[PDB]
Design an enzyme around this catalytic site. Structure first.
Site, PDB file in Angstrom:
ATOM      1  N   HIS A 194      -0.964   4.465  -0.413  1.00  0.00           N
ATOM      2  CA  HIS A 194      -0.052   3.350  -0.147  1.00  0.00           C
ATOM      3  C   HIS A 194      -0.234   2.701   1.222  1.00  0.00           C
ATOM      4  O   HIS A 194      -0.536   3.370   2.216  1.00  0.00           O
ATOM      5  CB  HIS A 194       1.417   3.793  -0.259  1.00  0.00           C
ATOM      6  CG  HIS A 194       1.697   4.697  -1.414  1.00  0.00           C
ATOM      7  ND1 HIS A 194       2.020   6.027  -1.252  1.00  0.00           N
ATOM      8  CD2 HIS A 194       1.698   4.467  -2.750  1.00  0.00           C
ATOM      9  CE1 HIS A 194       2.208   6.579  -2.438  1.00  0.00           C
ATOM     10  NE2 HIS A 194       2.020   5.653  -3.362  1.00  0.00           N
ATOM     11  N   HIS A 228       1.984   1.425   4.000  1.00  0.00           N
ATOM     12  CA  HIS A 228       3.355   1.549   4.496  1.00  0.00           C
ATOM     13  C   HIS A 228       3.626   0.437   5.500  1.00  0.00           C
ATOM     14  O   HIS A 228       2.685  -0.141   6.051  1.00  0.00           O
ATOM     15  CB  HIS A 228       3.582   2.918   5.125  1.00  0.00           C
ATOM     16  CG  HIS A 228       3.576   4.045   4.139  1.00  0.00           C
ATOM     17  ND1 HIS A 228       4.604   4.960   4.047  1.00  0.00           N
ATOM     18  CD2 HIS A 228       2.671   4.402   3.196  1.00  0.00           C
ATOM     19  CE1 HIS A 228       4.327   5.837   3.098  1.00  0.00           C
ATOM     20  NE2 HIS A 228       3.157   5.524   2.571  1.00  0.00           N
ATOM     21  N   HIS A 246       6.930   2.545   2.052  1.00  0.00           N
ATOM     22  CA  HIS A 246       5.906   1.682   1.463  1.00  0.00           C
ATOM     23  C   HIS A 246       6.202   0.218   1.798  1.00  0.00           C
ATOM     24  O   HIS A 246       7.359  -0.209   1.744  1.00  0.00           O
ATOM     25  CB  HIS A 246       5.815   1.871  -0.060  1.00  0.00           C
ATOM     26  CG  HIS A 246       5.531   3.283  -0.484  1.00  0.00           C
ATOM     27  ND1 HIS A 246       5.800   3.744  -1.757  1.00  0.00           N
ATOM     28  CD2 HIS A 246       5.026   4.337   0.198  1.00  0.00           C
ATOM     29  CE1 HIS A 246       5.459   5.018  -1.842  1.00  0.00           C
ATOM     30  NE2 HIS A 246       4.993   5.404  -0.668  1.00  0.00           N
ATOM     31  N   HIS A 250       9.707   1.314  -6.434  1.00  0.00           N
ATOM     32  CA  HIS A 250       8.339   1.808  -6.451  1.00  0.00           C
ATOM     33  C   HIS A 250       7.764   1.760  -7.857  1.00  0.00           C
ATOM     34  O   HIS A 250       8.477   1.979  -8.836  1.00  0.00           O
ATOM     35  CB  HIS A 250       8.285   3.239  -5.924  1.00  0.00           C
ATOM     36  CG  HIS A 250       6.922   3.850  -5.988  1.00  0.00           C
ATOM     37  ND1 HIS A 250       5.932   3.562  -5.072  1.00  0.00           N
ATOM     38  CD2 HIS A 250       6.380   4.725  -6.864  1.00  0.00           C
ATOM     39  CE1 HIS A 250       4.839   4.234  -5.384  1.00  0.00           C
ATOM     40  NE2 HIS A 250       5.087   4.950  -6.465  1.00  0.00           N
ATOM     41  N   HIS A 281       6.141  -1.971  -5.333  1.00  0.00           N
ATOM     42  CA  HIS A 281       6.062  -2.450  -3.955  1.00  0.00           C
ATOM     43  C   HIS A 281       4.712  -3.131  -3.773  1.00  0.00           C
ATOM     44  O   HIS A 281       3.747  -2.782  -4.455  1.00  0.00           O
ATOM     45  CB  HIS A 281       6.174  -1.290  -2.951  1.00  0.00           C
ATOM     46  CG  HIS A 281       7.420  -0.462  -3.090  1.00  0.00           C
ATOM     47  ND1 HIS A 281       7.420   0.911  -2.951  1.00  0.00           N
ATOM     48  CD2 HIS A 281       8.704  -0.812  -3.344  1.00  0.00           C
ATOM     49  CE1 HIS A 281       8.653   1.368  -3.097  1.00  0.00           C
ATOM     50  NE2 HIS A 281       9.449   0.343  -3.343  1.00  0.00           N
ATOM     51  N   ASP A 321       1.939  -0.611  -3.107  1.00  0.00           N
ATOM     52  CA  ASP A 321       1.676   0.401  -4.142  1.00  0.00           C
ATOM     53  C   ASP A 321       0.285   0.323  -4.762  1.00  0.00           C
ATOM     54  O   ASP A 321       0.066  -0.412  -5.734  1.00  0.00           O
ATOM     55  CB  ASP A 321       2.732   0.339  -5.249  1.00  0.00           C
ATOM     56  CG  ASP A 321       4.079   0.857  -4.797  1.00  0.00           C
ATOM     57  OD1 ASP A 321       4.133   1.573  -3.771  1.00  0.00           O
ATOM     58  OD2 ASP A 321       5.089   0.548  -5.466  1.00  0.00           O
ATOM     59  N   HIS A 365      -1.236  10.586   0.667  1.00  0.00           N
ATOM     60  CA  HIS A 365      -0.215  11.608   0.469  1.00  0.00           C
ATOM     61  C   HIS A 365      -0.770  12.905  -0.115  1.00  0.00           C
ATOM     62  O   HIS A 365      -1.855  12.919  -0.690  1.00  0.00           O
ATOM     63  CB  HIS A 365       0.923  11.065  -0.398  1.00  0.00           C
ATOM     64  CG  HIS A 365       1.710   9.979   0.263  1.00  0.00           C
ATOM     65  ND1 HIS A 365       2.923  10.208   0.880  1.00  0.00           N
ATOM     66  CD2 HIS A 365       1.446   8.662   0.425  1.00  0.00           C
ATOM     67  CE1 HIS A 365       3.376   9.072   1.384  1.00  0.00           C
ATOM     68  NE2 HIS A 365       2.499   8.120   1.121  1.00  0.00           N
ATOM     69  N   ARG A 394       2.631  13.185   4.112  1.00  0.00           N
ATOM     70  CA  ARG A 394       1.630  12.240   4.597  1.00  0.00           C
ATOM     71  C   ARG A 394       0.506  12.978   5.328  1.00  0.00           C
ATOM     72  O   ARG A 394       0.676  13.426   6.465  1.00  0.00           O
ATOM     73  CB  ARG A 394       2.295  11.187   5.483  1.00  0.00           C
ATOM     74  CG  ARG A 394       3.427  10.459   4.782  1.00  0.00           C
ATOM     75  CD  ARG A 394       4.176   9.518   5.693  1.00  0.00           C
ATOM     76  NE  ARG A 394       5.406   9.062   5.045  1.00  0.00           N
ATOM     77  CZ  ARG A 394       6.140   8.028   5.433  1.00  0.00           C
ATOM     78  NH1 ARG A 394       5.783   7.293   6.482  1.00  0.00           N
ATOM     79  NH2 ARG A 394       7.238   7.717   4.758  1.00  0.00           N
TER      80      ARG A 394
HETATM   81 ZN   LIG Z   1       5.876   2.248  -3.408  1.00  0.00          ZN
END
Ligand SMILES: [Zn+2]
Ligand SMILES: [Zn+2]
Lengths: 154, 154
Positions: free
Chosen positions: B45, B47, B62, B70, B79, B82, B120, B143
């Site tokens: 993602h 962020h 995100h 999401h 998002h 995403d 992640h 993360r």
């Molecule tokens: Zn997301």
């Protein structure tokens, strides 16, 4: 409306530098901190690229969208990224950054977002040093710390 | 005019990820590679914040300018940041990044310049996990690597 940016510096020296701009047309206010500097003046510039694939080298030259020679912050002729020198009063201490600049921005063509802040080993001669690197780099020598300039909260 | 962005990961895993966009109307192609990922899917993602002051934590959630739930990259509700999962075929190997996305951009309101690419620990359930966290993070967990998305040459 108010924008914020942030830079986490790492290398021979380190610290966090902040960029605050009230609106599109206002100067950018630079604050924060650099720790570990050798006493004396250090070149402090925004470089063109936010590319950390080859240390601070891949940042390229000073951010220069108007395609000018190097100078000091108050020079008639300067790069947009020309923020002069930060000065450490003593060795191995904490140096406060305090700069206001009208050329750098967090919006538009002069935006420094996604570019690289670089602290140099030697003083920036503001393009007045008289030798051949002076009109490009200020003869500020090696790149001792750098980081990519990111968008920050509030 | 064509744009390029780059991101160098810092954390448990390594890698350089590139971003390419032909026009402001065209999708972003995401390329490069991540080294050292554990077998299976890993949340991938953009962020919101390019703030690295507290590792990957200070990156915020995100990137989500539309403030939607999401989703996966193909989900109708998602998002902007995403990008689904990057999948390691085996342990401690080389994972190819190979994505085309119509939502992220290198220009305008959906620009990911100066923000943070995060990898992640756990798989992104693409908002299909059956609860609130799924509809927020995809339950992708911790993360493990991140870097600021910076502007690159040509
Ligand atoms: Zn997301
Ligand atoms: Zn310069």
């Amino acid at each position: 409306m108010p924008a914020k940016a942030v830079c986490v510096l790492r290398g021979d020296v380190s610290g966090t530098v902040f960029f605050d701009q009230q609106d599109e047309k206002s100067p950018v206010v630079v604050s924060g901190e650099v720790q570990g500097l050798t006493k004396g003046k250090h070149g402090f510039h925004v470089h063109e690229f936010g590319d950390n694939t080859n240390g601070c080298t891949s940042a390229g030259a000073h951010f220069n969208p108007e395609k000018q020679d190097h100078g000091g912050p108050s020079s008639a002729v300067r790069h947009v990224g020309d923020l002069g020198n930060i000065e450490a009063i003593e060795d191995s201490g904490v140096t406060k950054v305090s700069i206001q600049d009208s050329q750098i921005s967090l919006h538009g063509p002069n935006s420094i977002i996604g570019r690289t802040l670089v602290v140099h080993a030697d003083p920036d001669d503001l393009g007045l040093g008289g030798h051949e690197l002076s009109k490009t780099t200020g003869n500020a020598g090696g790149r001792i710390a750098c980081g990519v300039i990111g968008l920050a909260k509030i």
